[PDB]
Amino acid sequence: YTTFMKSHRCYDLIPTSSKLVVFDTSLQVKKAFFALVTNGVRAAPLWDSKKQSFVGMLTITDFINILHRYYKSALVQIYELEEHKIETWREVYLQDSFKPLVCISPNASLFDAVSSLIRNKIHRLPVIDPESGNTLYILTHKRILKFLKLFITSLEELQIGTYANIAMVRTTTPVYVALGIFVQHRVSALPVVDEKGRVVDIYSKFDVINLAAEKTYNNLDVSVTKALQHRVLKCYLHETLEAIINRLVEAEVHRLVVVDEHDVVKGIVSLSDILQALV
Amino acid sequence: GRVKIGHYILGDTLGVGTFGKVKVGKHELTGHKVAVKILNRQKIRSLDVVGKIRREIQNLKLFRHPHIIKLYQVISTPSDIFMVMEYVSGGELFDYICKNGRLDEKESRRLFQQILSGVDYCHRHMVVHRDLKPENVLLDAHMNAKIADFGLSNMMSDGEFLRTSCGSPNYAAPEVISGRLYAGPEVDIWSSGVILYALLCGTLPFDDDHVPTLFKKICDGIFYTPQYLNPSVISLLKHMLQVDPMKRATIKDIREHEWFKQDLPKYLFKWHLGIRSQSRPNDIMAEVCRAIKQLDYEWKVVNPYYLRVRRKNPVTSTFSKMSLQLYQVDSRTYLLDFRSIDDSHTIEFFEMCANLIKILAQ
Amino acid sequence: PTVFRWTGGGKEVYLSGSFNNWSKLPLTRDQNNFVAILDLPEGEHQYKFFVDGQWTHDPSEPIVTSQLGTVNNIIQVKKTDFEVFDALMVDSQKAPPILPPHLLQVILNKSCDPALLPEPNHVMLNHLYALSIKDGVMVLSATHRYKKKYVTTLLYKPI
Ligand SMILES: N#Cc1c(O)c2c(-c3ccc(-c4ccccc4O)cc3)c(Cl)sc2[nH]c1=O
Ligand SMILES: Nc1ncnc2c1ncn2[C@@H]1O[C@H](COP(=O)(O)OP(=O)(O)O)[C@@H](O)[C@H]1O
Ligand SMILES: Nc1ncnc2c1ncn2[C@@H]1O[C@H](COP(=O)(O)O)[C@@H](O)[C@H]1O
Ligand SMILES: Nc1ncnc2c1ncn2[C@@H]1O[C@H](COP(=O)(O)O)[C@@H](O)[C@H]1O
Ligand SMILES: [Cl-]
Ligand SMILES: [Cl-]
Ligand SMILES: [Cl-]
Ligand SMILES: [Cl-]
Ligand SMILES: [Cl-]
């Protein structure tokens, strides 16, 4: 399995004709998130015109962070977000705590990329050709795994992922509160629970763009269920890893909830975990 | 007392064609026959076609398709260059359609499949053989098509059009007779279309002794379809003989056509461009130059409407090139186009262009 | 091999040279072209013609006059003359156009993945396309190819 990854180059995974959105750090940050939504993209590289190079990647996490960091109430404007450039926020978010740009080459192996994703704890990575210096494509775990599923021709026994003290929200948990959990815990999805420990829904980082899309971000007081009104996937510990790997891809979702007999949460199994096991 | 090159004895001249005499060659020992194109070095430099021959050789040497004439070897001498190629006994397809009449539906289809296959292979190799006619389609003993005069051919480059209005006016595309810019493959389809008409009818679709009427007809794309023609092939001819290249059949549209598909062997097969200013063309060139130098960019004025410009990067300290070209959109409006020249390259290209726009018209 | 060609008429034309101990080798006629092709040891060779009972040289070709008044042609056969690409390389020493409709055929405008795009026509690669400056910010765009793959880059740049 890992042998396959060490041989295959990043290029092999790049699609025939793709779209790539680059934001100049001088762009106002609200315009940036709105452009992510308008172009139908989850992450865009950032170019520093003065530095003449790509400094980083703007993601939904940045949105979650501005929102939570600077939200006052539904009565006041998030002035900060409304008038703040990508550069002005990147310097606030990363003050003395500085971070550069993690990137792979197309001629570098698939292994090197998977390793880098885990090494730097990131879900989206850019591919930069050394000759041109041009960003070509952004490598997402879902894609690396889909290619692995095309190549392939229990959960309790193996034990892969975080199974204890899981980050969760309730039916009536406000979006703001949930955003704060996404911050302190540094996780991608929060399962929504009912009166009993049983799980009804799952609010993900991706459901947070809907705020930007529908321009409903000035009200984060709304319960997590209200937010998810603009629209489950479960797995057990007796189910085989290959059946779970199959269930994830034939639904194209980032993670599965490890549930009990009567819909009660027990742990989690993410695409990042599966790809660490197969490395 | 025999003239030899390789071990081939040079015989009778077969034709002249584009860039020089083609003679037969019979191998001294084996009797194997070849066609030898002779290029006089001093003659090929008199017309400045040295670049054309260099490219033509480079291409044809690595081609290997059963319906394109093979280039076996190029023998250079101090005085002349000899291009040794495969010899086909049957000669011109033109003479065939003269002697025997129009080919039956089945035989025309066979040949059209073979020709189009070859035409496709060319385009798959970024080569467009302008000047595609039955006079350049040779036949072998077994009645197979062999595409043969790559003299007027050209390469297809990323981001560029072709201009040369080459080939016979009967087989020439409307945009070619109009001396307009073209991509390349579309002009080979229009030519393959008239070949198909010749194969089925024994005559040319666009032909008249009066040249201006011939030219109106080509541009009005109007031709006569005799009664014997199958409406399905009439349908195909209508699609290939479109005056709008945008409305014209692509090799795909042809492969997908029901008439073509029949008995076919397996062995073959809101954004805006630039900025649009309404000023007088020469004013636009002054306006752009008084902006390019206002930005401290090195350049070279090729045509009076084409400018190749360079920029020294203040950070990476690496030069970045881009070419500007002004086209005419209307009877009233014109537009300046920006093309990227290969030595982030792409982002540095956008920045270059952008600056010029913030100080320019629509 | 070297080409020796006489351009004129004649009933019998011969080529005599240093490379054949000045023996009268005959030239075969095509039209007004009398030829014989032969390989020569890359160096200096002197030749002359026996055109229809008269000894001459080719006036267009380079000559050499002897201490004895002998006027012969001369041929410096070079190594570069025999290698095709070497030989070709040594040898190479208004109103505006109408906009081709091709440049109006895009892939961004024309269920599925928003990141994915149709394959472009070679002809529209490397050309700059841009969206109208709305809210003091410029959107620039171009399709480029890296190997057998294409990337359409959009730059959100303010102005
Ligand atoms: N036009 C022209 C032309 C030429 O014809 C040639 C020949 C040549 C080859 C063979 C014969 C020949 C002679 C007797 C009988 C049968 C034959 O084919 C004649 C000439 C060269 Cl070699 S270089 C060259 N350059 C030109 O520009
Ligand atoms: N390749 C990268 N180089 C540098 N920083 C990155 C890179 N990818 C992501 N980041 C940063 O890491 C943080 C988390 O991003 P990420 O988890 O990848 O987003 P998402 O879960 O929405 O895909 C953000 O602050 C983002 O700016
Ligand atoms: N809701 C969650 N609570 C706790 N851990 C989680 C949760 N979601 C993901 N993880 C873990 O976070 C890591 C990265 O996962 P992810 O951010 O979902 O791609 C893995 O080790 C997961 O097991
Ligand atoms: N295990 C899951 N069960 C149901 N929906 C899920 C699950 N994980 C993610 N989603 C959905 O996937 C979207 C977010 O995308 P992503 O972060 O790629 O998983 C949202 O619409 C979520 O509701
Ligand atoms: Cl001829
Ligand atoms: Cl014979
Ligand atoms: Cl034959
Ligand atoms: Cl005819
Ligand atoms: Cl002479």
Side-chain angles (χ1 to χ4, degrees), chain A residues 1-71 73-76 78-93 100-148 150 152-169 171-193 197 199-241 243-249 251-260 267-279, chain B residues 1-265 267-362, chain C residues 1-41 43-78 80-81 84-110 114-133 135-159:
Chain A
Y1 255 110
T2 309
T3 344
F4 177 95
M5 293 286 138
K6 290 208 170 185
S7 62
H8 281 73
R9 285 177 176 174
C10 296
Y11 171 90
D12 294 275
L13 260 179
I14 295 166
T16 181
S17 180
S18 52
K19 186 157 83 180
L20 197 102
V21 193
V22 179
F23 298 141
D24 198 298
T25 46
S26 54
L27 179 82
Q28 183 213 100
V29 84
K30 194 185 88 152
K31 296 177 193 166
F33 297 118
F34 282 12
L36 284 183
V37 168
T38 50
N39 291 287
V41 63
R42 253 189 79 149
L46 310 165
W47 173 266
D48 196 293
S49 199
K50 199 155 183 65
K51 289 212 142 284
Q52 278 295 299
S53 54
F54 301 107
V55 276
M57 276 265 272
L58 188 93
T59 184
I60 337 289
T61 313
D62 294 1
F63 187 57
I64 286 153
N65 275 287
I66 298 146
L67 244 52
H68 188 256
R69 169 140 201 174
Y70 299 113
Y71 177 77
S73 82
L75 303 190
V76 322
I78 305 184
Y79 306 127
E80 343 259 355
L81 150 117
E82 310 287 348
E83 284 286 301
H84 231 184
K85 293 173 282 172
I86 301 161
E87 53 197 46
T88 65
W89 188 67
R90 261 185 106 248
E91 65 169 73
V92 167
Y93 180 50
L101 166 88
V102 186
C103 63
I104 202 87
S105 178
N107 262 38
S109 95
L110 238 60
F111 172 86
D112 294 44
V114 176
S115 299
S116 215
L117 289 163
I118 303 157
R119 260 168 43 211
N120 302 276
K121 297 183 167 193
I122 53 144
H123 322 75
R124 319 227 144 209
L125 160 36
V127 179
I128 287 103
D129 164 59
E131 322 303 272
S132 64
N134 301 332
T135 308
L136 314 159
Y137 174 74
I138 296 165
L139 246 76
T140 59
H141 291 96
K142 293 179 179 179
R143 180 81 168 178
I144 296 132
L145 214 113
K146 199 164 176 179
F147 181 63
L148 188 137
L150 279 157
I152 191 62
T153 48
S154 95
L155 201 74
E156 198 181 287
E157 70 144 30
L158 273 139
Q159 283 148 123
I160 318 156
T162 311
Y163 293 100
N165 288 258
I166 299 318
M168 277 167 287
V169 288
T171 299
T172 41
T173 293
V175 185
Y176 181 92
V177 175
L179 292 181
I181 302 167
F182 281 143
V183 181
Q184 66 150 192
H185 277 89
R186 295 260 210 175
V187 290
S188 295
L190 306 170
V192 186
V193 301
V199 49
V200 288
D201 210 287
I202 185 143
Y203 188 83
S204 161
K205 282 187 152 164
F206 181 75
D207 301 294
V208 193
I209 30 91
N210 189 79
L211 290 160
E214 285 182 0
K215 293 157 190 166
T216 54
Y217 57 87
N218 228 78
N219 193 296
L220 307 173
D221 300 328
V222 280
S223 79
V224 103
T225 52
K226 284 162 192 158
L228 293 161
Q229 282 179 310
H230 78 282
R231 32 147 282 222
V232 296
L233 250 297
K234 293 169 188 176
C235 80
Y236 301 86
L237 290 154
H238 56 242
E239 309 191 328
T240 32
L241 186 70
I244 277 147
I245 271 154
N246 269 59
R247 219 180 244 190
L248 274 158
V249 288
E252 296 161 317
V253 126
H254 201 92
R255 94 246 78 226
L256 274 165
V257 183
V258 189
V259 87
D260 88 350
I268 216 97
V269 54
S270 193
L271 253 52
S272 68
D273 301 299
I274 290 138
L275 271 153
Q276 197 186 268
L278 299 150
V279 103
Chain B
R2 304 167 161 267
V3 186
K4 299 171 190 167
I5 194 79
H7 290 263
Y8 292 99
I9 79 85
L10 293 169
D12 308 269
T13 317
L14 290 155
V16 300
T18 314
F19 290 132
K21 276 193 166 159
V22 177
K23 286 167 175 292
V24 284
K26 198 184 185 178
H27 190 279
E28 214 184 356
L29 324 152
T30 66
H32 173 256
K33 282 157 219 196
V34 294
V36 190
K37 197 200 269 196
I38 318 163
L39 301 165
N40 183 307
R41 299 232 262 145
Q42 249 167 43
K43 295 186 188 187
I44 56 94
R45 38 187 289 274
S46 275
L47 295 174
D48 204 77
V49 301
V50 41
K52 304 211 115 230
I53 279 86
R54 186 198 93 228
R55 261 114 68 198
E56 196 194 333
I57 293 173
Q58 266 159 355
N59 299 329
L60 250 61
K61 223 167 198 304
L62 52 102
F63 275 21
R64 195 180 126 89
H65 177 296
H67 296 288
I68 306 160
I69 287 280
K70 292 162 194 65
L71 166 65
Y72 289 152
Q73 198 49 250
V74 184
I75 291 152
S76 179
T77 83
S79 36
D80 308 81
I81 298 170
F82 299 81
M83 285 173 61
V84 189
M85 306 162 296
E86 62 162 327
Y87 168 75
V88 300
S89 59
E92 286 195 27
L93 160 65
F94 170 76
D95 302 318
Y96 186 92
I97 309 164
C98 289
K99 205 165 101 282
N100 318 284
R102 58 188 151 268
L103 294 286
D104 61 296
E105 209 195 284
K106 303 288 184 196
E107 295 302 320
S108 312
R109 208 212 310 272
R110 184 186 112 107
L111 287 151
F112 178 70
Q113 276 155 11
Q114 300 179 334
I115 291 121
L116 204 75
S117 173
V119 177
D120 175 60
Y121 182 98
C122 286
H123 298 169
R124 297 191 104 87
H125 287 60
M126 302 302 271
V127 183
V128 56
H129 175 310
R130 281 98 41 108
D131 183 55
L132 215 54
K133 59 219 197 194
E135 297 90 328
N136 294 335
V137 175
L138 313 158
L139 294 162
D140 80 331
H142 296 283
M143 203 61 197
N144 313 300
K146 253 88 172 50
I147 301 161
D149 214 320
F150 283 79
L152 295 181
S153 98
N154 233 331
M155 289 299 301
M156 315 200 293
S157 197
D158 299 316
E160 280 141 90
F161 295 88
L162 290 165
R163 204 262 161 78
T164 304
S165 296
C166 43
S168 167
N170 304 80
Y171 305 89
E175 58 262 37
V176 167
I177 84 97
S178 310
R180 285 191 256 109
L181 291 168
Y182 54 99
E186 78 270 37
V187 315
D188 267 359
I189 306 304
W190 208 95
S191 296
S192 299
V194 304
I195 293 179
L196 176 61
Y197 183 100
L199 278 156
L200 298 161
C201 302
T203 55
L204 300 182
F206 309 97
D207 173 61
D208 212 313
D209 280 351
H210 187 76
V211 160
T213 58
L214 163 77
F215 285 40
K216 287 146 207 170
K217 286 159 164 188
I218 274 135
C219 304
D220 295 331
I222 184 180
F223 59 94
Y224 169 69
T225 57
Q227 209 90 45
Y228 50 85
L229 257 53
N230 175 352
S232 200
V233 75
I234 301 191
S235 178
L236 174 53
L237 293 153
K238 266 144 75 189
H239 198 16
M240 293 176 78
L241 308 177
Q242 278 294 321
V243 302
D244 186 345
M246 303 315 309
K247 287 203 78 204
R248 200 174 306 165
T250 68
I251 305 117
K252 171 218 175 69
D253 298 354
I254 316 174
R255 291 251 289 277
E256 290 169 357
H257 192 284
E258 287 316 309
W259 189 85
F260 190 81
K261 269 174 160 173
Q262 234 198 109
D263 316 326
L264 167 63
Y267 75 94
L268 341 110
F269 326 100
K270 191 213 289 164
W271 295 88
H272 315 286
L273 171 93
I275 60 102
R276 36 225 286 159
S277 189
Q278 214 145 30
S279 296
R280 211 208 270 234
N282 51 270
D283 315 343
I284 287 154
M285 291 294 117
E287 254 197 281
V288 301
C289 286
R290 72 203 180 87
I292 311 152
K293 199 258 171 182
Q294 186 173 355
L295 262 289
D296 210 306
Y297 294 156
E298 280 175 352
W299 78 83
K300 205 89 175 200
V301 183
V302 182
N303 301 325
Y305 310 97
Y306 185 108
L307 286 94
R308 271 198 134 100
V309 59
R310 200 200 208 187
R311 157 181 143 271
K312 193 164 191 154
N313 197 292
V315 181
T316 52
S317 305
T318 65
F319 297 91
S320 307
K321 279 186 167 199
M322 71 138 164
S323 54
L324 279 76
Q325 164 72 79
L326 177 78
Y327 299 95
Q328 194 183 296
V329 205
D330 258 308
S331 348
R332 286 280 156 272
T333 196
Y334 296 80
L335 97 81
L336 173 73
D337 185 40
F338 308 82
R339 196 185 73 87
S340 150
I341 304 161
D342 194 67
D343 324 321
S344 177
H345 178 82
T346 309
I347 315 302
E348 275 150 51
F349 167 74
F350 292 148
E351 293 198 332
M352 217 164 151
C353 299
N355 299 333
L356 234 171
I357 296 143
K358 220 258 173 187
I359 42 160
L360 246 119
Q362 189 176 67
Chain C
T2 309
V3 182
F4 285 96
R5 213 178 84 230
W6 186 263
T7 314
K11 272 177 254 207
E12 49 181 70
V13 178
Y14 306 87
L15 167 71
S16 179
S18 64
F19 49 72
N20 70 359
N21 298 322
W22 297 91
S23 65
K24 303 196 276 165
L25 177 63
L27 304 179
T28 323
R29 190 177 61 83
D30 181 33
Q31 218 190 301
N32 57 88
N33 279 312
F34 289 87
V35 219
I37 298 167
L38 23 108
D39 188 63
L40 304 188
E44 206 172 272
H45 308 282
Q46 265 179 65
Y47 62 110
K48 212 154 165 58
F49 292 88
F50 197 42
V51 190
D52 254 358
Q54 293 290 321
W55 281 110
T56 33
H57 61 269
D58 190 351
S60 57
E61 280 304 292
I63 70 173
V64 42
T65 314
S66 159
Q67 322 71 4
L68 285 100
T70 328
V71 173
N72 296 8
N73 270 140
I74 197 119
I75 181 134
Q76 209 62 51
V77 38
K78 318 186 179 186
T80 189
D81 287 344
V84 188
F85 282 95
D86 289 9
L88 295 174
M89 189 222 73
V90 79
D91 245 355
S92 48
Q93 276 158 313
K94 222 83 190 174
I98 319 93
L99 184 74
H102 310 67
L103 291 171
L104 292 178
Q105 273 254 288
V106 307
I107 50 153
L108 288 118
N109 294 304
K110 300 152 191 179
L116 293 191
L117 284 157
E119 215 212 86
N121 181 217
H122 77 282
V123 111
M124 70 119 152
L125 287 154
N126 314 344
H127 294 270
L128 177 122
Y129 289 80
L131 250 152
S132 326
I133 286 163
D135 239 319
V137 53
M138 199 170 183
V139 200
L140 292 176
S141 178
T143 316
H144 292 281
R145 63 141 208 83
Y146 172 81
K147 290 185 173 170
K148 307 154 275 90
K149 308 273 183 69
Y150 310 87
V151 182
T152 319
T153 336
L154 324 184
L155 177 58
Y156 276 77
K157 186 207 154 167
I159 50 87

